[PDB]
Design a binder for this molecule. Sequence first.
Ligand SMILES: *[C@H](C)[C@H]1/C(=C/c2[nH]c(/C=C3N=C(/C=C4\NC(=O)C(CC)=C4C)C(C)=C\3CCC(=O)O)c(CCC(=O)O)c2C)NC(=O)[C@@H]1C
Ligand SMILES: *[C@H](C)[C@H]1/C(=C/c2[nH]c(/C=C3N=C(/C=C4\NC(=O)C(CC)=C4C)C(C)=C\3CCC(=O)O)c(CCC(=O)O)c2C)NC(=O)[C@@H]1C
Ligand SMILES: *[C@H](C)[C@H]1/C(=C/c2[nH]c(/C=C3N=C(/C=C4\NC(=O)C(CC)=C4C)C(C)=C\3CCC(=O)O)c(CCC(=O)O)c2C)NC(=O)[C@@H]1C
Ligand SMILES: *[C@H](C)[C@H]1/C(=C/c2[nH]c(/C=C3N=C(/C=C4\NC(=O)C(CC)=C4C)C(C)=C\3CCC(=O)O)c(CCC(=O)O)c2C)NC(=O)[C@@H]1C
Ligand SMILES: *[C@H](C)[C@H]1/C(=C/c2[nH]c(/C=C3N=C(/C=C4\NC(=O)C(CC)=C4C)C(C)=C\3CCC(=O)O)c(CCC(=O)O)c2C)NC(=O)[C@@H]1C
Ligand SMILES: *[C@H](C)[C@H]1/C(=C/c2[nH]c(/C=C3N=C(/C=C4\NC(=O)C(CC)=C4C)C(C)=C\3CCC(=O)O)c(CCC(=O)O)c2C)NC(=O)[C@@H]1C
Ligand SMILES: *[C@H](C)[C@H]1/C(=C/c2[nH]c(/C=C3N=C(/C=C4\NC(=O)C(CC)=C4C)C(C)=C\3CCC(=O)O)c(CCC(=O)O)c2C)NC(=O)[C@@H]1C
Ligand SMILES: *[C@H](C)[C@H]1/C(=C/c2[nH]c(/C=C3N=C(/C=C4\NC(=O)C(CC)=C4C)C(C)=C\3CCC(=O)O)c(CCC(=O)O)c2C)NC(=O)[C@@H]1C
Ligand SMILES: *[C@H](C)[C@H]1/C(=C/c2[nH]c(/C=C3N=C(/C=C4\NC(=O)C(CC)=C4C)C(C)=C\3CCC(=O)O)c(CCC(=O)O)c2C)NC(=O)[C@@H]1C
Ligand SMILES: *[C@H](C)[C@H]1/C(=C/c2[nH]c(/C=C3N=C(/C=C4\NC(=O)C(CC)=C4C)C(C)=C\3CCC(=O)O)c(CCC(=O)O)c2C)NC(=O)[C@@H]1C
Ligand SMILES: *[C@H](C)[C@H]1/C(=C/c2[nH]c(/C=C3N=C(/C=C4\NC(=O)C(CC)=C4C)C(C)=C\3CCC(=O)O)c(CCC(=O)O)c2C)NC(=O)[C@@H]1C
Lengths: 221, 172, 172, 172, 172, 162, 162, 162, 162
Amino acid sequence: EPKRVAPYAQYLTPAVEATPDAAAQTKLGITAVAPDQAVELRPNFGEAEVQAVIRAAYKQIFGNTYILEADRVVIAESLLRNGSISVREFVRLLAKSDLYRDRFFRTASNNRFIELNFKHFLGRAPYSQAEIGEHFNRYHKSGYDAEIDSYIDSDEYRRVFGENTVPYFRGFKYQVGQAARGFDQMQQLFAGDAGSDTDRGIGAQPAAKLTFPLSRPLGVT
Amino acid sequence: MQDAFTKAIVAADLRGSFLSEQELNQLTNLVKESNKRLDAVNAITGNAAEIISDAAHKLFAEQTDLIRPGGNAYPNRRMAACLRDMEIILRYVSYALLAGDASVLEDRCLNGLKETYVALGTPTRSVARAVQLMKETAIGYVNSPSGVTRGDCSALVNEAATYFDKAAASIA
Amino acid sequence: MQDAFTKAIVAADLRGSFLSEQELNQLTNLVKESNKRLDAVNAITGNAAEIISDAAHKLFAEQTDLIRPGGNAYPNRRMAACLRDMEIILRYVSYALLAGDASVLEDRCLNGLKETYVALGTPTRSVARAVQLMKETAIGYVNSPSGVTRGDCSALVNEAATYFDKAAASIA
Amino acid sequence: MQDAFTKAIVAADLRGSFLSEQELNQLTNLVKESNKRLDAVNAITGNAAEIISDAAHKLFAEQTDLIRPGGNAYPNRRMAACLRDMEIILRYVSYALLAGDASVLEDRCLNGLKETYVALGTPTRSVARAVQLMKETAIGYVNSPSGVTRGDCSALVNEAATYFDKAAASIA
Amino acid sequence: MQDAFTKAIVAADLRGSFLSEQELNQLTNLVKESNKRLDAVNAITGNAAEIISDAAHKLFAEQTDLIRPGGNAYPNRRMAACLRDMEIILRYVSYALLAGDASVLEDRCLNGLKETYVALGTPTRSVARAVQLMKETAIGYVNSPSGVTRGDCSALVNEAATYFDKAAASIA
Amino acid sequence: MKTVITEVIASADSQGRFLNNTELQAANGRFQRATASMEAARALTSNADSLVKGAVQEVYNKFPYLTQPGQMGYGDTNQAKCARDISHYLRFITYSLVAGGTGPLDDYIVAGLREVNRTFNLSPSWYIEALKHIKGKVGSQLSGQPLTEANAYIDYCINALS
Amino acid sequence: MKTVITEVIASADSQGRFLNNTELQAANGRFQRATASMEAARALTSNADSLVKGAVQEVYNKFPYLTQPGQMGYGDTNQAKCARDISHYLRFITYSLVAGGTGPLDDYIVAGLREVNRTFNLSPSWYIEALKHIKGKVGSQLSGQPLTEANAYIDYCINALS
Amino acid sequence: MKTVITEVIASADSQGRFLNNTELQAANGRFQRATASMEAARALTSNADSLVKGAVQEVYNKFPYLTQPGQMGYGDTNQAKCARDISHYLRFITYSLVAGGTGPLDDYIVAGLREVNRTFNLSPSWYIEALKHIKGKVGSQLSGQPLTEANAYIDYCINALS
Amino acid sequence: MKTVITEVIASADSQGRFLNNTELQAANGRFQRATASMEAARALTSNADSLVKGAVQEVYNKFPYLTQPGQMGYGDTNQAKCARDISHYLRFITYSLVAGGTGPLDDYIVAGLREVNRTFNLSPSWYIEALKHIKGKVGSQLSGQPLTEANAYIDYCINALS
Ligand SMILES: *[C@H](C)[C@H]1/C(=C/c2[nH]c(/C=C3N=C(/C=C4\NC(=O)C(CC)=C4C)C(C)=C\3CCC(=O)O)c(CCC(=O)O)c2C)NC(=O)[C@@H]1C
Ligand SMILES: *[C@H](C)[C@H]1/C(=C/c2[nH]c(/C=C3N=C(/C=C4\NC(=O)C(CC)=C4C)C(C)=C\3CCC(=O)O)c(CCC(=O)O)c2C)NC(=O)[C@@H]1C
Ligand SMILES: *[C@H](C)[C@H]1/C(=C/c2[nH]c(/C=C3N=C(/C=C4\NC(=O)C(CC)=C4C)C(C)=C\3CCC(=O)O)c(CCC(=O)O)c2C)NC(=O)[C@@H]1C
Ligand SMILES: *[C@H](C)[C@H]1/C(=C/c2[nH]c(/C=C3N=C(/C=C4\NC(=O)C(CC)=C4C)C(C)=C\3CCC(=O)O)c(CCC(=O)O)c2C)NC(=O)[C@@H]1C
Ligand SMILES: *[C@H](C)[C@H]1/C(=C/c2[nH]c(/C=C3N=C(/C=C4\NC(=O)C(CC)=C4C)C(C)=C\3CCC(=O)O)c(CCC(=O)O)c2C)NC(=O)[C@@H]1C
Ligand SMILES: *[C@H](C)[C@H]1/C(=C/c2[nH]c(/C=C3N=C(/C=C4\NC(=O)C(CC)=C4C)C(C)=C\3CCC(=O)O)c(CCC(=O)O)c2C)NC(=O)[C@@H]1C
Ligand SMILES: *[C@H](C)[C@H]1/C(=C/c2[nH]c(/C=C3N=C(/C=C4\NC(=O)C(CC)=C4C)C(C)=C\3CCC(=O)O)c(CCC(=O)O)c2C)NC(=O)[C@@H]1C
Ligand SMILES: *[C@H](C)[C@H]1/C(=C/c2[nH]c(/C=C3N=C(/C=C4\NC(=O)C(CC)=C4C)C(C)=C\3CCC(=O)O)c(CCC(=O)O)c2C)NC(=O)[C@@H]1C
Ligand SMILES: *[C@H](C)[C@H]1/C(=C/c2[nH]c(/C=C3N=C(/C=C4\NC(=O)C(CC)=C4C)C(C)=C\3CCC(=O)O)c(CCC(=O)O)c2C)NC(=O)[C@@H]1C
Ligand SMILES: *[C@H](C)[C@H]1/C(=C/c2[nH]c(/C=C3N=C(/C=C4\NC(=O)C(CC)=C4C)C(C)=C\3CCC(=O)O)c(CCC(=O)O)c2C)NC(=O)[C@@H]1C
Ligand SMILES: *[C@H](C)[C@H]1/C(=C/c2[nH]c(/C=C3N=C(/C=C4\NC(=O)C(CC)=C4C)C(C)=C\3CCC(=O)O)c(CCC(=O)O)c2C)NC(=O)[C@@H]1C
């Protein structure tokens, strides 16, 4: 026979200005990528399962640009079947491709290229101007192959997606070490889900678009 | 993502309340139509290839320039992209139709699309046109199937329309 | 990165000069305080969990709506973030305190935080409030420990404050 | 993956033939049981936490040394793993139970497990034991529910057993 | 990783016991030597470049063929590697010396080294030789420094030796 | 938010393919079930309050000391909160029944559950009792599939809490 | 192989979570449908042959020139193959009905379809007619949901071919 | 295992460089401190037992209901465990003092703490009291830096537990 | 666009190095060949039309049924298109001769070839004949290296089409 019952009505009453949870996501259209599903290649993978990792990898690693029949890389994905190479090695083969060079690097400036490599190789955007410089020096000593290799072999790439996991957008959610500017810069690099990193409009890739960010003073507190 | 049910929930949540009896009855009714709803979707998916094929033919008969050198659908590579796009739009529309909600369509498919189109130089108006051409053909099937129990699908048909139109508008 | 020492260096470098004797004496005395400085840090880190816990309670007692349906701290998932953030800010502050320099705090933690908060729709003012609530609690510990040699920590206490405040300001 | 249906298909395929009428009748029957099958699964998933909790307690009461310094379940870190593992095995078992096929369990979970355990110095015997402890508890629920239509689940119960046992064996 | 202290701990842990007073006294005295220990390390690191340079010269004076076409240190590219490797080994040795424990050296550095050398066709014998050449030079510095308080370093010197030797052996 | 319908869309979408028969079959499942689910929700929604009172109460019987001064159960504010919270759990459960998926539960309640609870020193145990007590009551007002559904969701939380 | 059951397992498995109510609902859908599906398969399996004859035939009517010498339709070997092939399509379809998913179709027929067809200069068109003709016949022996199911799968191929 | 010495090695190692003056300075720090640390350990090690008794006890005073039948504190087995556990905490703390880093604590105690505690329904709270009570006693046997060190480590756990 | 010159630049650029002798050698190759290439282009450009008529025509002889009503070859629109298309192929070929690389061909014609052709049901076969017929005619107006070059490119398409 309980009867006292504190009313508890006030706690239930809605806030002055209310947002659905995931309102922040639906604005900014990061809804799809915010928490982002990981795809993992598993042992004794089926024929459909592999097809899905490939599908994923070409969407992330390549830009969200369109891979036509001709574009696809037969030899690399044959090795991915029959487990000759892991997905981490599959990604490395994709990144060193006429196709990856043709888009991305050959038309871009090294600032736009390095900023693109961050993102496709690791969801984050570049945290600081140093990171850009570190990679630009690496490229000048040792060329495009060593440049690419440095992202895939980076400790950060390995810890989040060692091997067997296709890279996903880790940006847009807080990552240890992140540094602020993460969230802001990732919104510039990532348009909507319809947007892509294409050059087809006018041959050149656009200019870096994270150079001015990356070098902004802190606003007078 | 979102859909008809989930949506109603969320609304209810902001009020802070259990679902209104009235509101349940929306969902209750919605369920009842399911079967119709499903068949509608099934019709699109079944005819997909053709819907597109068709729309395209008509699109290019009208807007000859797209396929002329200097136009946006020339050369092959470009043409191919345009076909892919049409399919994607369609695909989404269908998804929405099942969900019973525009959202999915708006977020994944339409979001960013205008800007892309702009950057490419693709003529948004023509895109929109295509979407409509598709619409009409699609409805055609939804509305005239074979071996289905005869009854009224109008309600669904109209909602379908709307989805197509949201697309047309946001692209345009 | 930077800290008290490194900073003075850098200045000297642009003049192109060896360090002024006067300038050494800044650093010389800075060293002397070390022990105090350390204990200060130790106090924060030791009480971390609590500092936050406390501040939160007070934050939510004041701004009831945050925890009401539709508010920014509701539901659980959001709440969690809010707690996480508090912690981070704190963590940085501590770092600064050890370094003897705002920089570290400004660059990794503060810079662009406001904008993030804006984009999310999280109410910057409330965040700032939280930071202060934290501040007071923290000082509380810094300033009232047990088993430490009794002496004057004011100098450090104030610098601590400033760090917290830079935070509050730039977020707000 | 594989499951009961797909399996039968594949066999049929290599013969190059339509499905045998006899073979259909396996599947036809399998369908009839579905509802039972489902409830079984539902029972496990619903009680998951408990099943484990329980089994563990008993495991550690028996093999005291596992939790003593120098044992394999010590210290915390290890203990955690041990719990996690138990759970996983369970998870898979359930999966299998639904599929109506061991495969999934064997291929994702059991394959290589023995050797791992060996290399680490985990005592395979004890692992196996745990699996059984789990088995019994689990069956307990499957077999004694409330608000389910009363009938005979034996057939399912035994198949469940087998899955657990495949596990026990391959680990051991 | 491991080092002198951590190690003793771990042992104690498996017994399940607090550290024996006897055992503390190992560590207590180990501390006392610190200063010596440090200087030792400092001496190596300070002379690093040279140590190597030197050893190399001697290595190549002895085994002329390494630097002849068809040898393993020819051409430049290879030579470079060979130098690099020597250095690494040294680096590790130093690390060990500080830790007061072989482990770090064994686990990061020596493990797999032999096999690599083998697969490449690098002559393990010669590698080992180099390591010794290094050893002697290094001791040279450890034992004859400038501005250090005069005292007995033998104990450290011998331990240094051992590290070098573990290296020599496992490579060879 | 994870419901049957959203998932199949998602899966379809990932592979880049139209909704084919495979997925619709699944959808159909959700819709057939709904009738039972919906029924259950109507039942909980109506008795809400009474369920809540009963639960809160129970907790105190189970853990008398909570009501003593200087404890968490003590002083009205806390009691109010305690009530509020359980209401929520219930609310969401209904939602999930109707939405035909755990989604609503996952996103509101489950995500971040642990840390919240840790930071405010809410003992999972409590909640659990609440739920159990509920489950027991519900085990009268409902029957057959409607019941079964109700349980599933209730449990789902128990497991998440524990 | 993609069936309803395998998928939900897969999805569950990826996230690393137990099968909860969400997935079972889906499964249930598959099982309810099965009765109709299975019926359809029994019907196709029985009339197989007759369907095949009719189809092959049709194709020739539709594309007379194939039967002329020096063409593909000409000379028995080719006709035999043509028959064989269609049999296959059918076979798989039945499989898919029973498996309750497109899986069987995808892996046998669809994957690699294009390239095979290109390298041997098989015109998709042909196959299509075959199928259509079939669909029309099936549209007599079956009715209601059984029919509906049959269609779905038949079409699925048409779309893949085109 | 994270100690001062191991870390500097690690950092040196990552960049691929020799230990230079920077790191040695740090190492020196560890060694200078040791004298105090070591002292503290000798003190805890000696009074271990007495500290443990006192703590266990305390917990029961703080949470009387634990000792009632049907609870966790009840029946000797549990008491034994309770003792054991606290011993452990202490043991490790000493270790950490001597090792000159949190390392020992992190790997034995902290990693996996939560889940263990969840699955067996050990309330962090309890442990905490134990520790606090300890801290208070230690606050007599020790003084100056030795004391300070002892605290640091004790706390470190409090924070990890909470 | 892939030409000899662009490639060597690209390769040089990737490695990050100045153009050394290696690449120039290659470039030189392109330039010396050009004289022949250029000649070939002048020849094709001039006879374009005649080549096109002849080809289109051929196709119809090869596939009479196309010209029947209700087919694709039927009605002027289609014929016009057919002409247009082949013109294109030719146009590009000339381009490629002059550019000294397949580049122009790849980007205009080849990329996306398949899908276009699939969606509109253009049979590669047709195009091929066109080309072959062309190749045969070209095999009169040209000779020696000029000829050789012409072939290479013409073929390149045949292979891409097939
Ligand atoms: C066809 C009806 C019309 C047309 C379309 C068109 N689009 C492109 C190129 C792109 N289109 C997209 C669009 C999308 N990506 C997505 O994921 C979605 C759905 C979510 C869409 C709609 C993109 C990203 C591209 C770039 C492709 C790439 O990265 O290579 C083109 C081709 C332009 C080009 O030169 O590539 C065309 C022609 N344009 C028309 O003229 C038609 C009216
Ligand atoms: C609407 C565009 C056209 C139409 C539809 C229509 N359908 C039904 C009934 C059913 N349709 C289905 C179909 C499915 N149910 C499923 O579970 C699946 C996926 C596996 C499908 C494809 C079913 C099962 C039914 C019930 C039995 C039946 O066939 O009748 C109706 C009848 C009304 C109702 O409420 O069911 C109608 C009207 N019919 C038209 O005339 C429209 C053009
Ligand atoms: C708590 C005092 C207030 C609060 C906080 C809050 N934050 C988020 C979400 C995010 N918080 C951050 C913040 C950071 N990113 C960084 O890099 C740093 C340090 C440099 C911080 C502090 C980020 C990136 C997010 C978004 C992604 C994520 O969730 O990790 C929320 C959730 C809002 C949302 O819709 O996501 C909240 C609630 N808001 C309040 O109500 C308190 C006043
Ligand atoms: C200031 C907030 C409080 C305070 C500080 C205070 N500390 C000391 C002296 C020492 N503090 C330490 C502490 C450390 N030294 C270290 O090496 C480390 C890291 C391992 C710590 C934590 C030490 C060793 C000393 C020297 C001996 C001692 O403890 O006294 C003083 C004394 C005066 C000085 O300038 O150092 C003071 C005042 N006292 C306050 O008023 C607050 C409680
Ligand atoms: C078996 C271990 C125990 C048992 C089972 C049992 N169940 C039924 C019947 C049903 N159970 C369900 C369950 C579900 N159907 C679904 O769609 C889902 C997921 C959403 C579930 C959980 C259903 C719907 C039925 C049919 C109707 C009913 O009222 O049960 C039976 C009856 C036999 C049958 O197959 O219909 C039985 C025997 N009963 C026991 O005593 C066993 C311990
Ligand atoms: C120098 C005294 C002798 C020598 C060395 C030499 N080494 C290589 C190549 C490699 N050596 C190593 C070394 C390491 N691998 C490890 O894991 C470690 C410890 C962490 C070391 C020190 C490795 C990895 C290689 C292969 C890859 C590389 O490029 O270094 C060579 C070159 C072999 C070749 O054929 O290119 C040489 C020459 N060999 C001599 O002639 C000396 C006796
Ligand atoms: C041993 C190979 C040689 C030797 C060593 C030696 N050193 C000392 C004493 C000290 N050495 C140092 C050096 C350091 N301490 C630090 O903190 C650092 C890092 C920044 C270094 C490099 C210090 C501080 C001392 C203490 C003060 C002093 O220098 O006297 C001794 C004296 C005995 C002792 O252990 O203190 C000795 C013997 N001397 C030899 O004869 C060897 C050749
Ligand atoms: C009831 C069994 C016990 C009790 C509970 C109690 N809860 C709080 C505070 C909170 N409880 C929650 C729980 C939720 N809030 C949400 O937003 C959600 C998701 C929708 C849940 C499940 C939260 C987040 C809080 C913290 C924020 C707040 O200020 O409420 C308290 C107060 C705790 C405090 O330290 O102030 C209490 C006491 N009260 C009882 O009597 C039972 C023991
Ligand atoms: C029938 C519509 C026309 C026809 C057919 C025809 N087919 C082939 C050759 C092949 N057809 C297939 C098709 C399949 N084989 C498979 O494995 C599968 C999936 C399981 C299918 C659908 C294949 C692979 C071949 C190539 C291998 C082979 O020929 O044995 C031919 C032979 C053509 C040739 O050898 O070049 C023919 C003629 N012929 C007719 O009568 C119709 C016009
Ligand atoms: C003491 C404050 C309370 C209490 C504790 C108690 N603990 C258990 C069981 C376990 N305790 C631990 C803790 C550890 N084991 C480790 O390996 C480590 C790291 C060194 C720790 C800290 C563990 C893991 C267990 C689980 C199983 C085991 O055998 O250890 C119990 C038994 C509870 C149970 O469900 O079995 C109890 C009661 N006892 C009291 O009286 C206090 C309330
Ligand atoms: C000629 C051998 C046959 C024929 C051809 C024919 N082609 C089309 C349609 C198209 N053909 C092409 C070809 C190209 N367009 C390009 O942009 C390029 C790259 C530069 C090529 C190679 C394209 C893309 C189309 C589609 C768009 C369009 O309208 O042109 C048709 C019409 C098909 C239709 O469905 O209307 C035809 C008939 N006609 C004949 O007589 C031969 C059989």
